[PDB]
Amino acid sequence: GNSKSGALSKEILEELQLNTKFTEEELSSWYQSFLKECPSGRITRQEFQTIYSKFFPEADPKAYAQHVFRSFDANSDGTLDFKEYVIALHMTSAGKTNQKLEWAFSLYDVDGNGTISKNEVLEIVTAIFKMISPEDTKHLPEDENTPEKRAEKIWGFFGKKDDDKLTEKEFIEGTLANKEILRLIQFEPQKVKEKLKEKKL
């Protein structure tokens, strides 16, 4: 930790790699500031939720923030340490999606039982949908303009029956190969929005 706490930034860089938006020295600085506000270096789910409530005033981010917080162990109780908190912000707001597919699986596997069910896709798709301001949902395709439609389209693209289980192997294959699945599972609010106002006539 430099010798006086701080080498937690190495673990972060390792687990995030090129995806990092920070050097270890900057992470330590953010960490020093983090500790002035959260002395224990831990952050609860309620506190994490507040971050998103504050920075997404146009949306209803509570469910979304809770699922993101849980992705780091499928637990609503407890806390996230600085490392998981930095990685969580990166997953929702920075970098490329294709480097986040393994984490995306953990996000979609709500109960953490190793596979994704149809209902879990709907729960997450709904949470992400609520991150879109009412103003933008009108630019959304007819067959992708409600949580139900989006979630069923994703399930259909995976060629699944109502009670089938979706594995990580297939989730990664499909999110990489089929760009429509990518578009529909997309969890970064800005990316959903920016594609939600582009394309072609």
Annotated binding site for Ca(2+): which residue ranges?
73, 75, 77, 79, 84, 109, 111, 113, 115, 120
Q: Could you say whether residue 111 binds Ca ion (CB under 5 A)?
A: yes
> Which is nearer to Ca ion, 69 or 85 (by Cβ)?
69
Tell me, by CB under 5 A, how many residues bind Ca ion: 3
Find the shortest distance in angstroms from Cβ 117 to Ca ion.
5
As beta bridge partners, residue 43 has: 80
Find the shortest distance in angstroms from Cβ 107 to Ca ion.
11
Q: Could you say whether residue 93 binds Ca ion (CB under 5 A)?
A: no
Find the shortest distance in angstroms from Cβ 192 to Ca ion.
23
- Largest Cα–Cα distance of the chain, in whole Å? 58
Q: What is the DSSP string of 45-85?
A: HHHHHHHHHHH-TTS--HHHHHHHHHTTTS-SSSEEEHHHH
Q: Pick left, alpha or beta for residue 169 (phi over 0 → left; psi -120 to 50 → alpha; otherwise beta).
A: alpha
Q: Could you say whether residue 113 binds Ca ion (CB under 5 A)?
A: yes
Q: Which amino acid is at 30?
A: W
Binding site for Ca ion (CB under 5 A): 109, 111, 113
